[PDB]
């Protein structure tokens, strides 16, 4: 049976407390395994999110992904290395409908506005077995999408056409496809490897997504020029991005000119969430989102100069935190807090307390003293959760020193009443679950503290008949030894700066 209740309502909260590191993973794991509805975990920072992308896998077999952030700052000067984009919008295709599974988004890409479904749905297409769709017609369709024709297709957004045989790499999928158009029609959907160059197998239907997160064709470029001449001004210069896209080429930092390419306000991606979707929160959003917006505004006013490439106002490209915390109130929320929340309904404090210090040191004759004392006096199941299988050998002989051989189980629920168990993952701080009395003892729980010390106080025997007791009654001129430098003559008091 469970321990708390899932919330389904407009903007209500469910507060879970007393939690410590590498237990948020198992809570949201049981959330995924118990709730019908996609779970979007919104991390307080992308760094933390990356860590979570490991640990959730360790505790569940349910489908997980991240939403790929552009790896540049707000108002930066770099294209996001469109490979990343290939991942990113792919999730935006499936995000309209995903019944189970978890998506981990940091607050940064949570508040960014994204391209509307009009563009992505319109410029997506399907290719089946039996279309009477012509060869160069499909090539021109790919052109209007905005892909790139190369004969050596290896990465995303690449296609080749050679007589009857055609191949391309859709930005949504992960493998390329070969076409073999005959009588102006599709006849084969053959997946051939980027390394083998030979057909692995034959599918019947597959989907195609456009170039990247904004259109590129000439109508869109005319729309871009119209909206620039509406808002900003123009100056004739071959580096000024107005005329530089009038030459057709997209600049480096063009992805921050999102709303100009689109003729409508950009959705805040909450429309991209399904209707029955639950959010879980970690840390405190009210601080991290606000700090990110302050950083964005500071970087904007720092860069809202250099009229050669001027910039947008963030109140269109990024959400405002008040708008974010209003639009959150259409999705039920579960806040995981690392703090003891006192009492109210929709609020349960789950005992997930700290493990006692099982520190291992060879200075004492018995290294595993705390471990051997703790495990024997414990009364419930203990799981070790080694990172790598080779590191599992690092388990095996060390637990052989007190002669302990654990079981290998996959799911945490395979813990029994009492015993020793090992599994594989990336969790880093164990804990004790008081409700089922579980123990988790991670890799870093036995190698906790980094130490830096060399030596001190070699000849400090300050009671020798020669230390002179620091009496300060010595006459000027009597020789004196300094331990670091040597022997000399004392020459009195002085005043310096």
């Amino acid at each position: 049976q469970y321990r708390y209740t899932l919330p389904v309502k407009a903007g209500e909260q469910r507060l879970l407390g007393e939690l410590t590191g590498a237990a948020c993973a198992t809570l949201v794991a049981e959330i995924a395994e118990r709730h019908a509805g996609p779970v979007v975990l919104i991390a307080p920072d992308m760094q933390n999110a990356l860590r979570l992308h490991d640990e959730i896998s360790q505790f569940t077999d349910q489908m997980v992904m991240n939403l790929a952030d552009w790896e540049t700052l707000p108002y930066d000067s770099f294209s996001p290395h469109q490979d990343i984009i290939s991942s990113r919008l792919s999730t935006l295709y499936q995000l309209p409908t995903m019944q189970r599974g978890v998506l981990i988004v940091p607050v940064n890409t949570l508040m960014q506005r994204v391209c509307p479904h009009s563009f992505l749905h319109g410029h997506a297409l399907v290719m089946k077995k039996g279309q009477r769709l012509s060869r160069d017609a499909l090539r021109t369709q790919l052109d209007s999408a905005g892909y790139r024709h190369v004969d050596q297709v290896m990465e995303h957004g690449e296609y080749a056409t050679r007589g009857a045989l055609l191949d391309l790499f859709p930005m949504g999928s992960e493998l390329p496809y070969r076409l073999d158009f005959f009588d102006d029609e599709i006849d084969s959907l053959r997946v051939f490897d980027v390394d083998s160059q030979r057909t692995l197998e034959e599918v019947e239907a597959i989907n195609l997504l456009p170039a990247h997160e904004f259109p590129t064709d000439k109508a869109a470029i005319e729309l871009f020029r119209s909206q620039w001449r509406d808002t900003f001004e123009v100056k004739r210069d071959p580096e000024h991005i107005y005329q530089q896209v009038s030459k057709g080429t997209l600049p480096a930092g063009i992805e921050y000119w999102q709303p100009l390419f689109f003729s409508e306000p950009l959705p805040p991606l909450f429309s991209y969430f399904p209707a029955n979707t639950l959010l879980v929160n970690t840390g405190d959003l009210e601080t991290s989102a606000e700090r990110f917006q302050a950083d964005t505004l500071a970087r904007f006013e720092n860069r809202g100069v250099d009229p050669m490439r001027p910039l947008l106002p963030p109140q269109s490209l990024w959400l405002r935190v008040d708008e974010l915390f209003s639009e959150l109130k259409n999705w039920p929320r579960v806040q995981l807090k690392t703090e003891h929340l006192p009492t109210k309904a929709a609020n349960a404090n789950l005992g997930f307390q700290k493990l006692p210090d099982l520190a291992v040191q060879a200075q004492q004759k018995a290294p595993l003293d705390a471990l051997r004392k703790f495990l024997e006096t414990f009364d419930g199941p203990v799981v070790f959760s080694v990172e790598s299988e080779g590191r599992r050998e690092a388990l095996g002989e060390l637990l052989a020193r007190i002669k302990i051989a654990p079981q290998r189980i996959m799911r945490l629920d395979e813990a029994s009443d009492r015993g020793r168990y090992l599994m594989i993952g990336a969790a880093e701080h164990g804990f004790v679950d008081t409700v089922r009395n579980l123990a988790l003892i991670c890799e870093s729980d036995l190698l906790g503290e980094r130490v830096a010390r060399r030596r001190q106080d070699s000849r400090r025997t300050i009671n020798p008949d020669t230390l002179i007791r620091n009496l300060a009654e010595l006459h000027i001129g009597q020789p004196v030894v300094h331990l670091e430098h040597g022997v000399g003559r004392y020459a009195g008091m002085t005043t310096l700066e």
Partner: protein
């Protein structure tokens, strides 16, 4: 008449224009331009009438 031929309307774009005349390339920022102008004539170490 110099105000009329001047294509600049405020202090910060003026500092940016001074930066872009000073250093070709190097797309200017705010702190870089204001620091350049503040140490161009008003620093006791990088500018000194005897």
């Amino acid at each position: 008449e110099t105000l009329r031929v001047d294509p600049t309307n405020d202090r910060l774009s003026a500092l940016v224009e001074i930066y872009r005349m000073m250093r070709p390339g190097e797309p200017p920022t705010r702190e870089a331009a204001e620091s350049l102008f503040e140490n161009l004539f008003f620093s006791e170490d990088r500018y000194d009438l005897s």
